[PDB]
Amino acid sequence: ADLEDNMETLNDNLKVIEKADNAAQVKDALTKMRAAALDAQKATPPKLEDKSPDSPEMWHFRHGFDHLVGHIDDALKLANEGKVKEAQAAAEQLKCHCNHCHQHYR
């Protein structure tokens, strides 16, 4: 899968969590988001195609996925503890991670 695919997965599944018709859909969507974020961390965004892997722009891009994965894991822990409403509230706060990275690099 490519970066565009990963971003579609992130977008669809964030919306799944918001509209989840049952509690179990939340964990499943978070699981897919986690994998998409780790896959996207290994891509080069078009606006950074000139930059080397050691460039500060690429460093911040990769770090954004690490941080998103950490907050996905926090929400997964809540869901796995049965605190699914808390997990859904935590998932809503993931949008700020999308917005921040996009501000820089989308």
Binding mask 55-84 for ligand HEC (x = CB under 6 A): ------x--xx--x----------------
Question: Which DSSP string corresponds to 63-94?
Answer: HHHHHHHHHHHHHHHHHHTT-HHHHHHHHHTT
58 is in an annotated binding site: no
- The region of 4-12, 34-42, 76-84, 90-98 touching a copy of itself under the rule CB under 8 A is 90-98
Residue pair 51/45 in contact (Cβ under 8 Å)? The answer is no
- The region of 23-31, 49-57, 81-89, 98-106 touching ligand HEC under the rule CB under 6 A is 98-106
Nearest CA to 77 out of 42, 31, 17 is that of 31
Residue pair 60/104 in contact (Cβ under 8 Å)? The answer is yes
DSSP assignment letter at 55: S
- Among 11, 55, 80, 93, which residue interacts with a copy of itself (rule: CB under 8 A)? 93
Binding mask 8-37 for ligand HEC (x = CB under 6 A): --xx--x-----------------------
Binding residues: 7
